[PDB]
From a paper:
Cytoplasmic dynein-1 (dynein) is a highly conserved molecular motor that moves toward the microtubule minus end, transporting various cargoes including RNAs, membrane vesicles, and viruses, and plays a crucial role in cell division. Lis1 is a dimer (~90 kDa) with an amino-terminal dimerization domain and carboxy-terminal β-propellers that bind to the dynein motor domain24,25.
We grouped the reconstructions into three distinct conformations on the basis of the position of dynein’s linker, a mechanical element that adopts different conformations in response to the ATP-hydrolysis-driven opening and closing of the ring: ‘straight’ (yellow outline), ‘interm’ (intermediate, green outline), and ‘bent’ (blue outline). We mapped nucleotides to their binding pockets, as all our structures showed nucleotide densities in the AAA modules. Although our maps have only partial densities in the stalk region, the ring opening and the stalk’s CC1 and CC2 positions in dynein with a straight linker is consistent with a strong microtubule-binding state, as indicated by the lack of bulging of CC2 in the stalk region characteristic of the weak microtubule-binding state. In the straight and intermediate dynein state, when Lis1 is not bound to dynein, the linker interacts with the AAA2 H2 loop, but these contact sites are less resolved when Lis1 is bound, suggesting reduced engagement in this region.
Author numbering:
A (entry chain A): 1385 to 1406, 1435 to 1467, 1473 to 1492, 1505 to 1902, 1905 to 2024, 2031 to 2237, 2244 to 2361, 2366 to 2466, ...
B (entry chain A): 3694 to 3737, 3741 to 3860, 3867 to 3916, 3920 to 4091
The structure:
């Protein structure tokens, strides 16, 4: 329980009690609780603080319920019933009060309930509406105040309104009444301004002297009305030149004033210039007419403005004439917005909207996008003098907000447009369709009230509804609207005349050539270049270019040079490379064609360690010139293209250039949750969390430190573009520049706050966003290889009289002539998890420099030649392990010969076993140690037998890990990746292991919780390991396992990239930067070609260093396994001289077993030395649990193990005989009795040790066990046969093995689970059955922990049955993979459970010894079963962990022999032979089944057993009835005779 | 599809009652129909000789209706299919360019049954439909729900819940083929029926004249006459899907309403001798009838038709058979309406109206029937392979 700011305490427990209750009283209690907290939120937020909205009956009820909730806070069923009744009552009352408040002022009805509550509660502040008026109206940002009064309102563009008379503000006033008189006076004032402007213009007042006096709308209406009147007067006669010249002179004078204007004056002058250019266009069109009727035609289409000179009312005294239809002006203020350039297509759109609105209908629009539909609707609304409420439709909009805004549009009379109506869900589209149909129904018949939203709302006769569409992307209008709308198509924006007017208004001398050339250029760019998805060369880009031309007009001048410079600045950074050369060619064809910043960038790069190139400098200049204007840039290149250094260099260069402080923050948005980045509302206590982005915005906006007033602040996002991560930022990106938060609070945006997106692909980006922000494309690599090597040398040297000489020697060692040849020759090699040849240079140079640093303490007593040889050999080894590290061993030999070649014969030749020790040569051959383990720990799965390759890989492992670089390990399964990890790190003295295993679903908190037990926080500000001298390293295996997202990425490897590259991150609950000093990360993975694997992004793997881990050589395995056989023959002394040939035979048979098979025939045909290990283990347990063996007995036991391990994944019998002849050949070749499956029948169920028993003895023992089971536990009427005898023998050998698991391949009702439970009873292992749905990982882990604890405490024989129906998801499969590869899964046991288990182990009996004993006991007494019937789990065999110790025994379907056996032994208990015939009936039955199956993959024998049982029961019943009838007939015959 | 089903059934019958030479003759005739094969059949009778004379005369649909008349000996109308119906629910269907209400009204007048026109819509329309179906389930009658596609969800809830019996109780639906997919229970729990209106250009002019009731003098009625004639001409031209227009638009009564209002308001503000024919011409061609048109060629075609119809010269030839004298100075509106009705009834439609009432070359309409013959022949060829 936690209490909020005052009074009531809130409990932190929800939906758990809901699950517990899921009686009626508890449900009522929960409903009352949820409603009391969900309403007490708003009570404390609104009612509990503001006194004006509580100081009549509603206020008294507010006080009473405040007292009641205070009493409830202090310390019942009737009381809570009263509270819920009162809460419903007050909610109805306040909803009705808000509704009638919105009725009093219909413009209030735009807002949400909370904001209107705040406005009403601001009964004395009188300035809370100044921050809401833009949302209230749409074109007024704030209300200016002059001594507790109103004299003006501030337009969004920045215009103040000189009111006719001020308004006093009494104390006992409410917002609604004074806002009523305010907006009515607003309309009156704009009318008064229009009237005096019209009077002045009619008097002959010059335009210039009245430009700087009145608002935009007054001068607009006056100019248009005077234009219309005078053109009508001069149209009644046939003269036009006089008014043409007058308008031309007015335009020229207005442009002359434009040249010498301030900001708002410039906006007014340009909008008036739009209007006057349109007037001159119309007049020039009219003068070009030759006959009067075509003149009347052309004048009829153009918009005409008129005025009532007779009506005394003034709010409707101006009306608009268009094609004989008349629309009445409404005189509502719009400010000074941008005016669309008048074009003939715009006039046609105006005309069709006039026709649609004349007869109580609505207009419509559909066609191409980026074409000018919504802006045309807005321009039409402005020309009629009311602001239209544009609804930018998307998935964000829902039903209630559209209902409210549409009802407000109705009640005001403001037109409600609809941008992109086809972007709505089905049910909301149906609802808004019904509402719009009802609105048009009301408008058509002229009824005063329309019954919508369960009310009777008023309807002004001037409202409208506008819609725009884009069909086929989709849909047209539905029929219910199609009956009451006018469709229209607006496909072609006249881009020639728009460019013409914009170049005229910008002041350029020759608008014609510029407009024609730029339209031609943009169409050629849209046509010729490749159709990348991020290109757009329509009209929006042209408008952006012309808007961006003006600073270059100020700098360079007015002419073609400014236009081409703007084109180079804007479009070019988004192009590719071929697109760039096309663009250059078109610039050359069409058109004719400051070193301080260059010096600043060069100096910043030289000081930062990077080296400048021509194209790198060019792109840096482009980025600087492009960040000059926009506040949101997005960079893009290939993976590792080199953009981070680009923007960091620009940051430091501009820090030198302008002197402002440069403060930058790096964020990875796709690993940070939206809840952590921004915040959310709690379900428990309804609280708000200040997210990281909210925290950084509050920090940079508060400016408490005062640094942000004299600095530039940058936030970069070094990830992809998640669309729902940018729909929360679109407000920041757009010109609103206001933070949108889910709680309700809003945060501003300083102009210095520049946001950067650092990405590599635009795969899932909406093209709308790439238009609102500038895009920069990095097509090619930003470096030469020599430059990258030099910079890496400088960074490595600074990362550390010997230094300069060492630098000179390494510099002359790296000669570019051979380096280019070796890199080009290394490009085409075979690579796994492919990484480009521009990337591995960092690993190469770092490993080489670290070797030189580690051996620098001997070179002072060494000659120049030996020093040069040592340096060259280390360089060669570094280049081998950085370039050839993703290629096979034979490719490694080829690479070592090549690197020996290109450095010449004079240099020190690099050997495969080359090593440098004290200076002189060495060799790794003599470094291998001789270790002789005894037979007590051969079964232990952490033992390592060293070889040449193991010690070589361990040496390069220590080398590269000390070289401060990341390890990711890849290679075919079975190469001992986990084994080499434990060998190279458990024996370490400087590093320690932490174990994490990756499932299909891993969260970032798992690895943090894992490393929490071995790390400490220091100020947190910095994270260090729990130790103090040994650098803790994080080990991850099977790292490819976690799944991708919906946008082609995975968060966990991005988190690891964050850990590796930036050396830090941000903690979620404190939003504070963390730094990591001495923690490395090492990874182990499978190739992506395996099923269930995904290719990792090159962005993450590029920072680490890869290292291929292939299959070991045959001689290496031979040496390891002869050491194995020596250890295993230390037990028996008579055969101690036969160690080597058995190892040679084993490796030989494995070699042809791998060579003779292909994985394309069966999914379980995979080979890796783990089967050879379990071969050795099975031989070990057989020898230890056996009698005094002989040579022949040993050979037949080894062949028995080979058959029971290897030869069990086989389809037919031919390969079984091939295996048998292979065994015969190996036994006769390297050193006879029968070695068939039935001849090798070693068991232990008849004696005290593993030996060969009699067939009759074993079947008699099985029968005795079966009859005892039937008499004791369950009466299951089954029968024995040869195939199931062999299979239960195999599964019993599997169970008697320690930790060696098993799996079965058989159809349904084949007896797999029955056999497993029977052999579990036979071996004494208890069986527990999972009751799997209705359970999950929690119940699974709890039951498994209880069973494991009982087994370890009471020494009970425990095992679990598993069906394929029990397993559902891949998480279970990954859990069993970890359980088989390891024995102690790290994530299960930590914390209280670990403490309880360790205390129990201590009571039963160091911590490491107890953990090892736990591993041993869980290996001894755990054996799970895996059942497959459809050979989701197809890739499970290909996983190394499941294949690590499982036995893949092909149970299969019943064949002819065992079918005959079960049939004859089943029908032998019922008399049927009356007319042998049982053999005939069973063979014709099976022949029928064979024919049927081949007329219409194993055979399911369910039909078999079902038919045999049904036949048996039916024969018995029919024969009993027949016998009764015959006996009755005989009795009747005896009685009658 | 009616013709395709007819031809498949004819092939199924005559491919098993008769020998294989008949089968080969049918195959080669269908191949020539598809313009896929060239070959004279193994001629022997008289019917196949008539077919060969047809296909040498390149009169395809003539031979196709000759198939229909020669093999089939009867046809079914709406009256027969509603006469013998075990069920009581009929879902009438059509396209959006042809109405089906007046045929049902004529049937109701013929059958002396009370038909209620119930166009759906808002909640008021839904309540009206509910009251009407309650009344006709209490005391019988006939119910028409006009254009139920606009309330597909309302249908899918209300009508489905109603269906899941009063004597002489029938009801009728109305849906457009080129609309939204109807649910399966609605399609199969009814007697499906579709009506195809023959393009009677003069007949739809008469129906449009009778539907209206006519106002500024004789010029108003004369302009209404010319506008009605233009609307009929463009509605006939829009039937030719690949030749009259590049796309199948659908003009309806609302467009005529807006054009009529515009003409009335132009003539009201201008009753002078020089009526602005160019202004009304461009306004109709770009805004009234050019609203749904985007391709340049379609605009050019509609502009040509407007320039031919609304020229307003001394004498006008809407079709090469008849002429329209304009009303003179001393004329009254009632006798003018009578005179225009007389000049409508004086008109006799020639058989080549589809290539002479719409100003199209005859090669174009032969190409259109060639395309329709090719597509039906290809459909038959694909269907006969199974
Ligand atoms: N002038 C230069 N000379 C040498 N090396 C340079 C130069 N400029 C950039 N580089 C190199 O370019 C690289 C820049 O890294 P980059 O921008 O690709 O990182 P990133 O944002 O993590 O990449 P990605 O998004 O592809 O994962 C660095 O390795 C740096 O050494
Ligand atoms: N006078 C004008 N005529 C036509 N289009 C214009 C004019 N002025 C601006 N535009 C462009 O028209 C665009 C409007 O596009 P819009 O129709 O809203 O696309 P969508 O409907 O797909 O959102 C604006 O981005 C603007 O650049
Ligand atoms: N060079 C080697 N020396 C000793 N044992 C090896 C060697 N290579 C493979 N093995 C054996 O093969 C197995 C390798 O398992 P491993 O590949 O680590 O499984 P996973 O990849 O699933 O962790 C080990 O049981 C080990 O006994
Ligand atoms: N050889 C058999 N004869 C008769 N019934 C059998 C035989 N094998 C299995 N069954 C029946 O199948 C049922 C369970 O089969 P199940 O264990 O699911 O087979 P599997 O493990 O191969 O899927 C048992 O109740 C048993 O009666």
């Amino acid at each position: 329980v936690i209490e909020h700011s005052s009074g009531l305490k809130l409990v932190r427990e929800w939906d758990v009690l809901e699950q517990a209750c899921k009686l009626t009283k508890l449900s009522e209690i929960q409903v009352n609780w949820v409603e009391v907290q969900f309403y007490w939120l708003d009570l404390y937020g609104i009612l509990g603080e503001n006194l004006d909205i509580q100081n009549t009956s509603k206020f008294k009820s507010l006080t009473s319920e405040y007292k009641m909730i205070t009493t409830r806070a202090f310390q019942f069923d009737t009381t809570l019933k009263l509270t819920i009744d009162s809460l419903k009552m007050i909610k109805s009352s306040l909803s009705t009060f808000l509704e009638r408040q919105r009725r009093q002022f219909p413009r209030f009805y735009f807002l949400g309930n909370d904001d209107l509550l705040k406005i009403i509660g601001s009964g004395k502040h009188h300035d809370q509406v100044s921050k809401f008026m833009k949302k209230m109206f749409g074109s007024i940002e704030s209300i200016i105040f002059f001594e507790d009064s109103i004299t003006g309102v501030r337009s969004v563009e920045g215009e103040v309104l000189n009111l006719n008379e001020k308004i006093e503000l009494k104390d006992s006033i409410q917002a609604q009444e004074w806002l009523n008189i305010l907006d009515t006076e607003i309309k009156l004032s704009v009318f008064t301004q229009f009237r005096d402007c019209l009077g002045q213009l009619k008097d002959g007042t010059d335009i210039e002297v009245v430009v700087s006096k009145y608002i935009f709308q007054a001068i607009l209406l006056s100019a248009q009305v005077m234009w219309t009147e005078l053109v009508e007067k001069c149209l009644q006669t046939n003269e036009f030149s006089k008014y043409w010249k007058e308008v031309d002179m007015k335009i020229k004078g207005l442009l002359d004033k434009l040249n010498k204007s301030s900001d708002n004056v410039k906006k007014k002058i340009e909008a008036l210039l739009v209007e006057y250019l349109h007037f001159n266009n119309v007049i020039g069109q009219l003068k070009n007419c030759s006959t009067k009727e075509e003149a009347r035609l052309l004048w009829a289409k153009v918009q005409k403005f008129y005025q009532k000179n007779d009506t005394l009312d003034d709010l409707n005294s101006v009306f608009i004439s268009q094609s004989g239809y008349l629309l009445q002006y409404k005189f509502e203020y719009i400010g000074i917005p941008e005016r669309l350039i008048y074009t003939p297509l715009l006039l046609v759109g105006f005309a069709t909207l006039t026709d649609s609105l004349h007869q109580k209908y609505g207009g419509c629009f559909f066609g191409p996008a980026g074409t000018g539909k919504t802006e045309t609707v807005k321009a039409f609304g402005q020309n009629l003098g009311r602001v239209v409420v544009v609804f930018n439709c998307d998935d964000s909009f829902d039903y209630q907000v559209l209902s409210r805004l549409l009802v407000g549009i109705t009640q005001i009379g403001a037109w409600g447009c609809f941008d992109e109506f086809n972007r709505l869900d089905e049910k909301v589209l149906s609802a808004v369709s019904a509402n719009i149909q009802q609105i048009q129904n009301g408008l058509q018949v002229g009824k005063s009230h329309i019954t919508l939203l369960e009310e009777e709302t008023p309807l002004s006769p001037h409202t409208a509804v506008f819609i725009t569409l884009n069909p086929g992307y989709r849909s047209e209008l539905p029929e219910n609207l199609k009956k009451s709308f006018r469709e229209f198509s607006m496909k072609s924006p006249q881009s020639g005349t728009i460019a013409e007017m914009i170049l005229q208004i910008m002041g350029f001398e020759d608008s014609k050539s510029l407009a024609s050339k730029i339209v031609h250029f943009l169409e050629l760019l849209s046509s010729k270049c490749s159709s990348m998805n991020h290109y757009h060369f329509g009209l929006r880009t042209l408008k952006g270019v012309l808007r961006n031309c003006s600073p270059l007009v100020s700098e360079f001048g007015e002419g073609e040079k400014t236009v081409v410079e703007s084109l180079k600045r804007v479009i070019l950074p988004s192009l590719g490379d071929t697109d760039e050369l096309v663009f250059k060619d078109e610039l050359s064809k069409i058109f004719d064609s400051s070193k301080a910043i260059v010096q600043c960038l060069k100096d910043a790069g030289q000081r930062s360690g990077f080296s400048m190139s021509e194209e790198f400098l060019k792109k840096c200049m482009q980025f600087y010139y492009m960040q000059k204007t926009q506040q949101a840039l997005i960079l893009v290149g290939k993976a590792g293209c080199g953009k981070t250094a680009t923007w960091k260099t620009v940051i430091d260069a501009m820090a030198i250039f302008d002197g402002h402080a440069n403060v930058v923050y790096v964020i990875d948005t796709k690993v940070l949750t939206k809840e952590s980045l921004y915040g959310s509302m709690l379900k428990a206590t309804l609280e708000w969390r200040d997210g990281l982005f909210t925290s950084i915005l509050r920090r940079v906006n508060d400016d408490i430190t005062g640094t942000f007033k004299n600095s530039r602040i940058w936030v970069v996002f070094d990830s992809d573009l998640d669309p729902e991560y940018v729909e929360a930022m679109n407000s920041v990106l757009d010109d609103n520049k206001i933070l949108t938060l889910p709680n309700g609070e809003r945060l501003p945006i300083p102009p210095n706050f520049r946001i950067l997106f650092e990405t590599d692909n635009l795969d899932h980006t909406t093209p709308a966003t790439i238009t609102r922000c500038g895009l920069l494309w990095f097509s090619t690599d930003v470096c030469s290889i020599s430059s990258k090597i030099d910079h890496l040398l400088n960074k490595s040297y600074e990362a550390l009289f010997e230094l300069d000489k060492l630098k000179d020697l390494i510099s002359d060692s790296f000669d570019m002539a051979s380096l280019t040849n070796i890199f080009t020759c290394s490009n085409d090699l075979v690579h796994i998890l492919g990484v480009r040849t521009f990337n591995k240079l960092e690993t190469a140079v770092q490993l080489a420099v670290h070797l030189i640093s580690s051996y620098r303490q001997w070179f002072q007593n060494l000659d120049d030649k030996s020093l040069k040889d040592v340096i060259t050999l280390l360089i060669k080894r570094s280049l081998l392990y950085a370039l050839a590290g993703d290629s096979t061993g034979e490719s490694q030999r080829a690479f070592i010969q090549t690197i020996n070649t290109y450095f010449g014969h004079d240099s020190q030749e690099l050997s495969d076993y080359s090593t440098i020790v004290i200076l002189s040569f060495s060799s790794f051959c003599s470094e291998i140690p001789s270790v002789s383990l005894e037979a007590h720990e051969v079964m232990r799965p952490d033992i390592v037998i060293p070889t040449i390759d193991t010690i070589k890989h361990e040496k390069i492992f220590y080398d590269l890990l000390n070289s401060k670089r990341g390890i990711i390990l890849c290679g075919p399964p079975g190469s001992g990746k986990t084994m080499i990890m434990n060998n190279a790190l458990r024996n370490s003295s400087l590093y320690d292991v932490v174990g994490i295993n990756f499932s299909k679903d891993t969260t970032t908190e798992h690895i943090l919780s894992a490393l929490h037990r071995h790390t400490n926080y220091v100020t947190g500000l910095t994270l260090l390991p729990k130790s103090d001298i040994k650098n803790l390293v994080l080990f991850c295996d099977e790292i490819n396992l976690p799944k991708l997202d919906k946008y082609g990425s995975q968060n966990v490897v991005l988190f690891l990239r964050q850990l590796m590259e930036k050396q830090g991150f941000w903690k979620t609950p404190e939003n504070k930067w963390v730094t990591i000093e001495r923690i490395h990360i090492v990874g182990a993975c499978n190739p992506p070609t395996d099923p269930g694997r995904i290719p990792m992004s090159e962005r993450f793997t590029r920072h680490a260093a890869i290292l291929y881990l292939g299959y070991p050589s045959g001689k290496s395995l031979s040496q390891i396994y002869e050491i194995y056989y020596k250890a295993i023959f230390k037990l028996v002394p008579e055969f101690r001289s036969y160690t080597e040939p058995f190892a040679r035979a084993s490796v030989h048979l494995y070699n042809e077993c791998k060579a003779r098979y292909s994985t394309g025939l069966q999914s379980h045909y995979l080979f890796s030395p783990r089967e050879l290990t379990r071969l050795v283990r099975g031989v070990y347990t057989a020898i230890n649990t056996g009698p005094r063996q002989t040579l022949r007995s040993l050979i037949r036991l080894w062949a028995y193990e080979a058959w029971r391990i290897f030869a069990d994944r086989l389809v037919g019998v031919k390969e079984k005989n091939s295996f048998e002849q292979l065994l015969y050949e190996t036994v006769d070749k390297y050193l006879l009795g029968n070695i068939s499956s039935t001849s090798l029948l070693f068991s232990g169920l008849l004696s005290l040790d593993f030996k060969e028993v009699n067939k009759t003895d074993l079947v008699n023992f099985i029968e005795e066990r079966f009859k005892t089971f039937c008499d004791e536990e369950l009466e299951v009427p089954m029968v024995i046969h040869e195939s199931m005898v062999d299979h239960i023998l195999r599964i019993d050998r599997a169970l008697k093995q320690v930790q060696g698991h098993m799996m079965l391949i058989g159809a349904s009702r084949t007896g797999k689970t029955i056999l497993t439970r029977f052999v579990a009873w036979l071996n004494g292992l208890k069986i527990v059955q999972p009751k799997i749905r209705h359970s999950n990982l929690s119940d699974f882990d709890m039951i498994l922990k209880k069973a494991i604890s009982d087994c370890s405490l009471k020494e009970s024989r425990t095992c679990l049955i598993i069906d394929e129906s029990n397993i559902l998801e891949t998480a279970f499969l990954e859990r069993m993979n970890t359980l088989l590869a390891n024995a102690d899964i790290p994530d299960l046991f930590q914390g209280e459970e670990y403490d309880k288990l360790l205390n129990n182990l201590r009571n039963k009996t160091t911590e490491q010894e107890l953990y090892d004993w736990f591993v041993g006991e869980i290996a001894k007494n755990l054996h799970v079963v895996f059942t497959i019937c459809d050979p989701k789990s197809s890739a499970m065999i290909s996983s190394p962990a499941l294949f690590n110790r499982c036995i893949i025994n092909w149970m299969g379907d019943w064949d002819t022999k065992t079918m005959s056996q079960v049939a004859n032994n089943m029908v032998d208990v019922v008399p049927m032979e009356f007319t042998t015939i049982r053999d005939a009936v069973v063979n014709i039955l099976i022949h029928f089944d064979r024919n049927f199956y081949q007329k219409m993959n194993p055979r399911s024998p369910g039909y078999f057993i079902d038919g045999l049982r049904a036949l048996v029961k039916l024969v018995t019943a029919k024969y009993q009835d027949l016998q009764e009838n015959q006996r009755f007939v005989n009795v009747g015959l005896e009685k009658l005779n | 599809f009616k013709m395709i089903m007819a031809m498949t059934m004819f092939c199924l019958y005559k491919f098993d009652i008769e020998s294989e030479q008949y089968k080969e003759a049918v195959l080669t005739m269908i191949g020539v129909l598809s313009e896929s094969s060239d070959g004279v059949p193994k001629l022997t009778n008289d019917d196949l000789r008539y077919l060969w004379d047809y296909v040498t005369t390149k009169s395809y649909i003539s031979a196709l209706n000759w198939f229909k008349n020669e093999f089939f000996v009867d046809e079914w109308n709406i009256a027969d299919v509603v006469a013998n119906s075990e069920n009581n629910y009929f879902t009438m269907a059509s396209e959006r360019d042809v109405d089906g209400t007046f045929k049902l009204i004529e049937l109701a007048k013929a059958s002396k049954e009370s038909l209620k026109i119930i166009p759906l819509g808002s909640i008021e329309n839904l309540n009206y439909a509910q009251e009407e179906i309650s009344k006709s389930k209490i005391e019988g009658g006939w119910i028409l729900l006009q254009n139920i596609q606009m309330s597909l969800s309302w249908v899918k809830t209300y009508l489905h819940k109603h269906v899941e019996e009063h004597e002489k109780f029938k009801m009728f639906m109305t849906c457009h083929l080129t609309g939204d997919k109807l649910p399966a229970p609605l399609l199969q729990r009814t007697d499906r029926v579709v009506y195809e209106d023959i393009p009677g250009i003069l007949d739809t002019v008469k129906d449009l004249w009778g539907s209206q009731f006519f106002i500024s003098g004789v010029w108003s009625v004369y302009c209404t006459f010319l506008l009605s004639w233009f609307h009929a001409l463009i509605t006939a031209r829009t039937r030719l899907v690949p030749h009259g227009f590049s796309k199948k638009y659908y003009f309806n009564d609302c467009d005529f309403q807006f054009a009529s209002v515009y003409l009335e308001n132009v003539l009201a503000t201008n009753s002078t001798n020089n009526i602005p024919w160019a202004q009304v011409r461009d306004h109709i061609a770009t805004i009234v009838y050019g609203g749904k048109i985007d391709e340049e060629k379609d605009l050019e075609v509609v502009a040509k038709l407007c320039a031919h119809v609304f020229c307003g010269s001394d004498n006008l030839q809407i079709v090469p058979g008849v002429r329209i004298p304009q009303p003179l100075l001393q004329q009254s509106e009632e006798e003018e309406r009578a005179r225009l009705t007389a000049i409508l009834s004086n008109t006799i439609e020639p058989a080549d109206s589809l290539s002479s009432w719409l100003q199209l070359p005859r090669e174009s309409i032969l190409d259109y029937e060639r395309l329709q013959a090719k597509e039906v022949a290809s459909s038959t060829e694909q269907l006969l392979q199974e």
